[PDB]
Structure 1
Amino acid sequence: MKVRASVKRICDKCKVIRRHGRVYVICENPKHKQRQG
């Protein structure tokens, strides 16, 4: 689920991501595709 936007730490505690220039967040749960990219 590459959402276009928002993203605000929804597997509760969650890691900001920086890779390929692209910037995301992954935590413990796959049901948390916060790729606003």
Structure 2
Amino acid sequence: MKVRASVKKLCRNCKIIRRDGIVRVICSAEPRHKQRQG
């Protein structure tokens, strides 16, 4: 997981979710596209 101050979609299966007051990006295709914070 990559922690950055600015997270956003990197492909066309990335989804933006707000989970316990934290914006996360989850990818159903490539696990390398997981992000936290931002």
Q: Classify the TM-score, shorter chain.
A: 0.5 to 0.7
Q: Which has more strand, going by share of residues?
A: 2
Instruction: List, as ranges, runs of 4+ consecutive aligned residues in structure 1 with deviation greater than 2 Å.
Output: none
Q: TM-score scaled to structure 2, two decimals? A: 0.59
CA RMSD of aligned residues (A): 1.5
What percentage of aligned pairs have identical amino acids? Answer: 66
Question: Where does structure 1 lack aligned partners over 5 or more consecutive residues?
Answer: none
Paired residues in the alignment total 35
Q: Which has more helix, going by share of residues?
A: 2
